[PDB]
Design a protein around this ligand. Sequence first.
Ligand SMILES: O=c1ccn([C@@H]2O[C@H](COP(=O)(O)OP(=O)(O)O)[C@@H](O)[C@H]2O)c(=O)[nH]1
Ligand SMILES: O=c1ccn([C@@H]2O[C@H](COP(=O)(O)OP(=O)(O)O)[C@@H](O)[C@H]2O)c(=O)[nH]1
Ligand SMILES: Nc1ccn([C@H]2C[C@H](O)[C@@H](CO)O2)c(=O)n1
Ligand SMILES: Nc1ccn([C@H]2C[C@H](O)[C@@H](CO)O2)c(=O)n1
Ligand SMILES: [Ca+2]
Ligand SMILES: [Mg+2]
Ligand SMILES: [Mg+2]
Lengths: 222, 221
Amino acid sequence: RIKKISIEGNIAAGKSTFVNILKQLCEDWEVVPEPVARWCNVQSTNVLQMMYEKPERWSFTFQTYACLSRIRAQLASLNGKEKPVLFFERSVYSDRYIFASNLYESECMNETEWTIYQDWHDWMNNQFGQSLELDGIIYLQATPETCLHRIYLRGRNEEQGIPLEYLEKLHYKHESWLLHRTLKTNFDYLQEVPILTLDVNEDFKDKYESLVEKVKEFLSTL
Amino acid sequence: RIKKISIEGNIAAGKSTFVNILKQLCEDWEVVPEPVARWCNVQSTNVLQMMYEKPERWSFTFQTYACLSRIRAQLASLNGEKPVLFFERSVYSDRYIFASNLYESECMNETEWTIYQDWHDWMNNQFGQSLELDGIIYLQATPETCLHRIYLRGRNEEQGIPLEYLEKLHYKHESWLLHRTLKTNFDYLQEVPILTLDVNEDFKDKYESLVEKVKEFLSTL
Ligand SMILES: O=c1ccn([C@@H]2O[C@H](COP(=O)(O)OP(=O)(O)O)[C@@H](O)[C@H]2O)c(=O)[nH]1
Ligand SMILES: O=c1ccn([C@@H]2O[C@H](COP(=O)(O)OP(=O)(O)O)[C@@H](O)[C@H]2O)c(=O)[nH]1
Ligand SMILES: Nc1ccn([C@H]2C[C@H](O)[C@@H](CO)O2)c(=O)n1
Ligand SMILES: Nc1ccn([C@H]2C[C@H](O)[C@@H](CO)O2)c(=O)n1
Ligand SMILES: [Ca+2]
Ligand SMILES: [Mg+2]
Ligand SMILES: [Mg+2]
C-alpha cells in the first residue's frame, strides 16, 4: 500500500543530501537512511574502516553485516507511516550487484565467500524481503570525479583514501544497472521498475526546484 | 504439534550413529542431520577444512554459514500421529559451544563475535520461534573417547584436532547440559528436559538400554 522508492548513487553522490531535501518537501514522505552509523560503531569498532583498511579480509564480513542491517532498518520503517511514499538510501540490490559484486570481481572476496554471500542474499530476500520490493528507483547520477570531490568534501575519514579507480568501477556498475539497464539480477520484477535518472554533477543544495519537479512527475505514474 | 528433540554431543561422540539407530525404530521419527556435507562442498571448497586450517581467519565466516544452513535445513524438514523430529546439534550448541569457544580462544575478535551474536539473536527471533526444542538428549562421552572416534571415523579436516580443544568443548557441554549453569538468551531453554546418556562404551550393537531410556524421556513430553 506504501509506495517504495530507492535512491541509488555512487559514494558521496548526494543521496543523503538529496533524501533530506525531500523529507521536509512533504509531510507524507518518510526516509530510511543507510544505517551507516551502525556499521561504524560495532562494539566501539568501525567495520567500514576495517574493510577499507584490509578488504581482502573484511569485505565479506562487512558486506554481510551492511546488508543485514539495511534490511532490518527498512523492514522496520514499514510500520509507522494518505499518499505514503518511502525513500530508501541504496537498496539490497545495489548492495549485492554493485558493492559486493565489485569486491568479488576485485579479488577482495574469494569463491567461497562470494558463493556464501549470494546464497545468503537470495535466502534473505526470498524470506524477510518480499515486502521490500521497489516500485521505483531514482538514480542520482554523477561522474567518478564529482563523487570523489564530495568524499573529500564530506570529510569522512575511512573514505579519504579511496582511489578514483574504485569510484570508476562502481560508477560503471551503477550505469549498467540503472542507466542502460543491462546488468541482470535474480529479481525478475526489477526489469519492469521505472528508473528516474537525475544528473547531480552540479550542486543542488540550493538549486533543486527542477530535481524535485521531476521527482513528482515520476511518482505520479506509479 | 510436532515434538522437537535435539541431540547434542562433542565431536565424534556418536550423534549420527545414534540418530540413525532411531530414524528406523518408528515411521513416526524423522531425523534432521547436521548439514556437514553442505559445508564441505561450497563451490568445490571445504569451509570446515578452511576453519580448521586458519581459524583466526575463517571461524566467523564458517560459524555464520554453519548456523544459517542448520536453520534452513531444520525449518525445511519442519514442513512436510505422534510426530517426533530429531535435530543433530542445534542453534544453541552452535553459539554457546562452538562459536563461543572460538571467541574465547581468540579465533574471533570483538567485532566478529559481536556481529555473530546480534545476527544469531535476530535469526532465531525471526524465522525461529517454531524451532523451539521440547527436549534435549545429551550423548555424553569423555574427550578421550571422542578423540579416538575422530580417528575411527577418519574424516580428514579433523585428524589434527588436539585433545585440549576436545576438552574445552566437553566442558561447554557439561556446563550447559549437565550442571546447567551456562545461561542463554532463550529463557525457555533452562526449563527444557535433558536426558543424558553415557556413550563412552560402543552402542552400535548394544543400544537396547539407550533406546529404552529415550522412550521414557519422550513419554513425559
Ligand atoms: O549538491 C551537493 C551534493 C553533495 N555535497 C557534499 O557532498 C558530501 C556528501 O554528500 P552526501 O552526504 O549526500 O553523500 P551520499 O549520501 O550521496 O553518500 C557532503 O559533505 C555534501 O555537503 C555538496 O556540497 N553539494
Ligand atoms: O557406539 C559407537 C558410537 C560411535 N562409534 C564411532 O565413532 C565415530 C564418530 O561417530 P559419529 O559419526 O556418530 O560422530 P558424531 O556425528 O556424533 O560427531 C564413527 O567412526 C563411529 O562408528 C563407534 O564405533 N561406536
Ligand atoms: N554494500 C555496501 C554499501 C555501502 N558501502 C559503503 C560506501 C560508503 O563508503 C559507505 C556509506 O555508503 O558504505 C559498501 O562498501 N557496501
Ligand atoms: N558450530 C559448529 C558446528 C560444528 N562444527 C564441526 C565439528 C565437526 O568437525 C563437524 C561435524 O560436527 O563440524 C563446528 O566447528 N562448529
Ligand atoms: Ca565510537
Ligand atoms: Mg550517505
Ligand atoms: Mg555428524
